Amino acid sequence: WRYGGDPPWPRVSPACAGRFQSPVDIRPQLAAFSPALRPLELLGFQLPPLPELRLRNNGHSVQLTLPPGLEMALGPGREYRALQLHLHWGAAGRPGSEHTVEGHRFPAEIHVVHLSTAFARVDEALGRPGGLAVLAAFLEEGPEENSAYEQLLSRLEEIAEEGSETQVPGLDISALLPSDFSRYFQYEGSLTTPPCAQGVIWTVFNQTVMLSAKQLHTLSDTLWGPGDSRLQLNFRATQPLNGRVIEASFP
Amino acid sequence: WRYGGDPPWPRVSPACAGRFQSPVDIRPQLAAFSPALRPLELLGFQLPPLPELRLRNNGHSVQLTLPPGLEMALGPGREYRALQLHLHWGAAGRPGSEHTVEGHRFPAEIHVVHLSTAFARVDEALGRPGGLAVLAAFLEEGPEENSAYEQLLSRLEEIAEEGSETQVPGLDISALLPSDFSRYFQYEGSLTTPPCAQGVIWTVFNQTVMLSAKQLHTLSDTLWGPGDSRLQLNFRATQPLNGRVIEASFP
Numbered sequence: 389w390r391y392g393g394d395p396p397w398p399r400v401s402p403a404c405a406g407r408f409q410s411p412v413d414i415r416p417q418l419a420a421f422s423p424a425l426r427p428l429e430l431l432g433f434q435l436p437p438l439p440e441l442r443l444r445n446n447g448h449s450v451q452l453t454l455p456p457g458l459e460m461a462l463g464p465g466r467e468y469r470a471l472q473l474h475l476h477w478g479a480a481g482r483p484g485s486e487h488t489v490e491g492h493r494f495p496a497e498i499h500v501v502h503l504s505t506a507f508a509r510v511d512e513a514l515g516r517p518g519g520l521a522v523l524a525a526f527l528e529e530g531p532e533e534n535s536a537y538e539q540l541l542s543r544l545e546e547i548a549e550e551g552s553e554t555q556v557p558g559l560d561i562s563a564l565l566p567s568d569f570s571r572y573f574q575y576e577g578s579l580t581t582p583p584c585a586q587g588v589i590w591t592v593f594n595q596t597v598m599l600s601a602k603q604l605h606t607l608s609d610t611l612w613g614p615g616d617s618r619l620q621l622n623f624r625a626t627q628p629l630n631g632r633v634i635e636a637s638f639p
Numbered sequence: 640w641r642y643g644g645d646p647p648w649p650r651v652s653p654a655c656a657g658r659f660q661s662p663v664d665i666r667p668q669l670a671a672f673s674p675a676l677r678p679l680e681l682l683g684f685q686l687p688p689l690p691e692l693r694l695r696n697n698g699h700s701v702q703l704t705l706p707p708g709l710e711m712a713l714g715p716g717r718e719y720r721a722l723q724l725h726l727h728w729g730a731a732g733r734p735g736s737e738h739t740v741e742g743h744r745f746p747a748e749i750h751v752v753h754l755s756t757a758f759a760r761v762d763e764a765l766g767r768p769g770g771l772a773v774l775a776a777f778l779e780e781g782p783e784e785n786s787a788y789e790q791l792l793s794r795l796e797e798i799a800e801e802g803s804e805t806q807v808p809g810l811d812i813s814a815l816l817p818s819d820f821s822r823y824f825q826y827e828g829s830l831t832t833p834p835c836a837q838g839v840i841w842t843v844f845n846q847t848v849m850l851s852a853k854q855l856h857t858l859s860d861t862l863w864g865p866g867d868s869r870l871q872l873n874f875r876a877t878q879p880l881n882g883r884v885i886e887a888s889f890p
């Protein structure tokens with residue numbers, strides 16, 4: 389499968405034709421304030437330099453495989469383990485976030501994908517309610533260089549080739565996300581690539597993360613995808629809410 | 640195991656000492672109004688007289704086995720199939736609801752237990768978030784004989800001894816539930832008997848159902864449990880919320 393080209397995604401996986409897909413356009417006017425939504429809690433995200441982590445150009449994104457012991461709770465009793473993180477981006481002067489806010493697309497977006505602690509593997513969790521959870525944050529252009537992101541962005545040149553990988557030092561994974569874990573939107577949707585399984589709990593932070601213009605250019609300009617094409621605009625089209633209500637942890 | 644005394648339930652199932660158990664004390668002023676909570680949808684609950692349904696004294700309650708085709712939804716795409724319903728009650732002049740409201744225990748309680756349609760079998764769903772969903776309603780004393788409950792209550796004499804069972808005509812299962820499907824409390828907890836599996840979505844109706852004094856007496860004073868012993872006071876004590884916030888579908 390590819391972005392913006394065949395083969396249709398429903399031909400690859402029937403679930404990609406589900407009613408309750410991601411990403412979505414977040415309309416904060418239509419979000420339901422839900423004071424049951426408490427601040428997110430992360431454990432084990434401050435990684436030491438060793439062991440190193442695998443960073444891969446899989447031809448659709450750059451993906452960092454996370455080690456065991458990264459624990460995340462959406463609440464009491466809603467516990468998850470982090471599996472991997474990856475990024476979605478655009479191209480020179482063209483935004484490439486997956487989620488939009490009132491139709492506005494942001495320059496890029498980070499997804500941290502987690503498995504519910506009730507499941508031992510991803511394939512048992514696919515399509516099950518709350519089986520997977522994703523933490524998502526928008527990346528915007530800021531004045532300063534983000535030093536947490538520089539650790540990964542400085543390594544993209546090694547993995548320019550489609551299907552290539554490299555080992556990188558452990559880093560503070562939580563420093564790739566916003567500092568405010570109390571303000572977020574939450575809704576139930578899907579994986580945004582095949583197999584597009586539903587039951588995924590998406591949490592989208594209100595606060596954004598700032599990268600420099602150079603950093604954003606490095607992200608969009610360095611990697612190559614399938615065919616002789618640049619790996620760019622690697623975001624799925626907006627999917628309708630279809631009656632789902634997005635919750636907000638703040639009024 | 641048995642209600643009242645030992646064997647401590649943790650000795651039978653260590654799961655019963657989990658952090659997120661049911662039932663709980665509902666305190667409506669501390670419940671969180673969540674406008675995303677939509678009216679419950681129940682289709683296929685209006686059963687014809689045939690085929691007949693199994694009604695069983697199992698020593699811990701009276702349980703009606705439900706046929707296939709009772710579909711329930713808690714939300715968009717969050718669907719369930721009904722498995723069975725059973726009751727909890729007290730004894731002469733003593734209430735035996737499981738859930739309580741601000742300390743108040745009601746005469747009795749009905750539990751309609753469902754399986755998430757993401758799972759083929761109950762055993763796969765046990766311990767998985769949202770795997771099972773229970774619809775719970777309080778039973779109260781009113782001036783009139785409840786016609787719906789009378790179809791079950793008039794058959795208890797036939798199954799008085801522990802482990803006996805009879806066949807009853809199909810009935811409208813939705814007629815056992817309260818008037819307003821838009822007004823409920825919701826939280827995540829557990830089965831209230833061993834094996835005390837967690838991940839159970841409990842939906843407790845704001846409105847009650849009314850049975851006559853004669854009907855409540857009949858429920859509490861007809862069935863026999865484990866030993867020459869009456870089947871009475873078959874409720875678990877309330878359990879600490881341990882940080883869980885009870886949500887409400889209404890302000």
Ligand SMILES: [Zn+2]
Nearest residue numbers: 474476499580
């Ligand atoms: Zn993604």
Ligand SMILES: [Zn+2]
Nearest residue numbers: 725727750831
């Ligand atoms: Zn019960």
